[PDB]
Symmetry: D2
């Protein structure tokens, strides 16, 4: 059969897609209309969106379907899809509905890690004690101590291990520090923004959606109810993200440091590095004070 | 601080770690579960909820302690709140089912489509080309002089499929639906109007049912056509599995094509001999 | 330029290859002859083999040396390669030599995992104690139970203690056993640490292991063959016979060691078959260790489930508030 | 059981786990290192020996316990044998270098070749030399009627009265690869390689003579070091020639080679190729559509005609 609208490759792709898809065009239409969640999936929508003929082509494909049987499977599909009101925006609202909960799930953790880390630090007394005996802390390893052949870090860690068995527990109170050092405050924000726009757009497309030109189209029906809930959820998320940014300020005072020059990621990435440096030093002392124990046995 | 009166040490430890990262008011989590709030629920969440959810007996014992709610630890408070959601488990398993269904159909369908296509692709020239250097090159040779042009995009896919697991999946799906359906039919009376469970589920189960039926039609069909193959190439549709049939048919299409490519390479290399000599 | 021998595609492919390769065709030839390992790599040899014009096609390009400069580069290369004796077996032997160490390194651990698992099983004082408690549990402390009086050392059977109720039906034999250990034989609980290679042994494939060895055996035999029949070197830069004769001996040495290690592995396994009464020729190594592994896992799960059950059972006691 | 006499608790624990899985008799490990046995040694094997190896100070203290070898724990016996290998560390590092060399060269060459080939393809394509950053502004502002873009416009003009540009995009095979390369990293790779070769070379020169017929280190490394240098020199020849062809472009296209890095240059040049083909692709698209709309009316006309 010959093509009367679709262009070469475009038809080439639809032929494939729909083929390995295997599903009556009318069923696809009704699945899209009723938003059948027993059929629809993230990818399925991404594929329809990525394979759907341009609107201008759909208008051309429907402006002469009296010869339906005479159209290639690719263009027959085109005709059907030409019957769906507000196709593209409809598809995005649907895609959004399928993606939301999960893209929130992907964000929240970042926020919680940082939040927890900040909470952990402030409430960590052992780390406070460690500060006494003492951001610019990953430098102790780069100095010397009372005597020689032992970085200040070691002496600090040893002094801790001898009569401060407790300070040697601070790493076990800074659980989320590592997860926090992995976060990207920049990216964290971009996400909440893209999301902000995402919800806005879908709300618009809905508040601008037509009426029931077919008692099968139950779009505005659900979608309006969803956006509502997606909103309540986005707000709560933003509040969490604010509580984070906020709690990170409090540390900028208590531990006194500039929360404008040092990002949340960078900051913690160092506190984490130091926490390791400390654990490393402790292991090194245990080694030294283990071989030296022999160097004195070798005199016997 | 805060003694445990029901949860066992480890359950409490785990529930605590879990809640402390989920970060969400327990009552709100309850509502989310009740109304199957799809703007919050995800496959992971449900699975995690199911994995962490204290056992029924522990939830009960806790529900009989709502009294000192403020004295109970976080882990045990979540318990009290969850201990008020009727049919927690079958409910959670139904939601997990709704969240997973379309995905599993999407992952099962392609296996059937490939195999089906390979079957359709065959019936619709490669027949005469085997029954009749090596034998391949020989027959290939003839299909170049006397019967040329007598030289399947799914035959390859079909060879990687596994008929056995394909059946197990459909059978596994069948149970899943039947189980959800049963749980729904045996569900309590929704007092708290915030519980839109029986409604949603009864409807979804209907849809999954229609899709499963359609999916099973595609299956049986696939097998029907496979036997149509046991006719033309007269063989035991059970002695040789779909996987194998197309595996051979595949290793075949290759060797022949290679035999052809090899022939043509000698072919041209001869042209680059007739000219060079004159 | 214009092709005098090579088909069209071969000329194309070979060009892109020689191109993004940048190296005088003679230099390439010397690298192959000298088996220069400061240049040669596994990928490099594989490609030369994949892109090398057919043996016959190289023969033809031999009558075209006068017009070397007239020929297209793809064919110039063909002209050079055409000068190298036993080009393909040579190339295959070099690839073999470059891959040999990794190959041994990938077979050895399978053998070491199974072997160590067997030794660990023999030497585990706590697992041995556990077997005894198992006999005690099924032959004397649960007369009611399933096969009471017929328990032995079958490992897969131990995997079923989980599916059988003990005397009082408030516990499976597995849990009964676990509690017995926890209460009166704590040390036994440390048996898992005494079986470090068991999990790895469960993931092995005796069949593939055997295939790997036989393959290595043929690979080495083939190279030796090719070396035994190799033509006397004309060009001084041809180090093949020199390097490869030596290598083959070395590789044969390693393979024999592998074969013997594998043979020792099979011997220990036969011993396990008589001790845990199973047929080595019917219960693959991975099957046996998967059973031992799964048992170790469920036994540990059983212990946690007991502690849990014990803890909540105390909340029932303190319910008297 | 078996009291440790030198090793620190951790090292011994780790050595034990390691030796538990490596399972190669200690003499055999030494023999293999001394023979530099290629049928046995692997990059991974050597990296693990290096990582597990007790520090020099411990190997020396164990080196003085040969008489009690049989009473020592497995990890310390291993230490004793290893302790008898002269220049163990430089030996192990040179061996690792010899195993890694040809491949780290193989991972550098490609980049140099991509950029090099790109520079060559460019200079040999007048098809581009002509087309004259701004190409962006055209794609920005719409044509007379919003119906099109000024880039499509220029693209169609070329496509009509200069159809010898449809090839341009296909004569820039390595430009994309070149856009991904990193000039700075390439340099480091080369300097890092030079240093590695120097250090090994140094160790071979200051290396103790063999006192047994099994130690093949000097014989092999001295020879290999010569081969690595030859290859490195050639690798550098290629590199500088790459920097030179690029320099040549700073003129043939007037632009400061110091300012704009190699990645920067071919990245823009990559996007350009993209933007153009884009327009051409798009033009051919809407022009194909117009064609079908024409045949649409024609048929829809012969229709109403044949009908009546």
């Amino acid at each position: 059969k010959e093509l009367k609208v679709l262009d070469s490759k475009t038809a080439q792709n639809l032929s494939i897609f729909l083929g390995s898809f295997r599903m009556p065009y009318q069923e696809i239409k009704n699945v899209i209309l009723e938003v059948n969640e027993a059929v629809l999936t993230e990818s399925m929508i991404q594929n329809l969106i990525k394979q759907m003929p341009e609107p201008e082509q759909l208008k051309m494909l429907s402006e002469l379907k009296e010869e339906y049987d005479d159209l290639a499977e690719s263009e027959q599909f085109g005709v059907v899809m030409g019957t769906v009101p507000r196709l593209r925006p409809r598809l995005n609202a649907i895609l959004f509905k399928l993606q939301f909960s999960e893209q929130v799930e992907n964000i929240k953790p970042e926020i919680v890690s940082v939040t927890a880390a900040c909470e952990e630090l402030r409430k960590s007394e052992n780390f406070s004690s460690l500060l006494e005996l003492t951001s610019f802390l990953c430098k102790l390893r780069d100095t010397k101590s009372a005597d020689q052949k032992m970085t200040l870090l070691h002496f600090l860690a040893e002094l801790c291990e001898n009569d401060h068995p407790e300070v040697l527990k601070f790493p076990d109170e800074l659980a989320h520090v590592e997860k926090a050092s992995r976060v990207s405050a920049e990216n964290l924000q971009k996400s909440l923004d893209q999301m902000k726009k995402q919800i806005a757009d879908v709300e618009r497309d809905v508040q601008n959606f037509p009426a029931a030109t077919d008692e099968k189209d139950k779009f505005v029906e659900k979608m309006t109810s969803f956006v509502k809930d997606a909103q309540e959820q986005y707000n709560k998320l933003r509040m969490m993200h604010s509580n984070m940014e906020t709690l990170y300020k409090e540390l900028g005072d208590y531990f006194v440091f500039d929360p404008k020059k040092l990002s949340v990621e960078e900051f913690f990435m160092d506190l984490h590095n130091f926490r390791n440096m400390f654990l490393q030093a402790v292991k090194e002392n245990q080694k030294r004070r283990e071989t030296e124990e022999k160097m004195r046995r070798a005199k016997l």
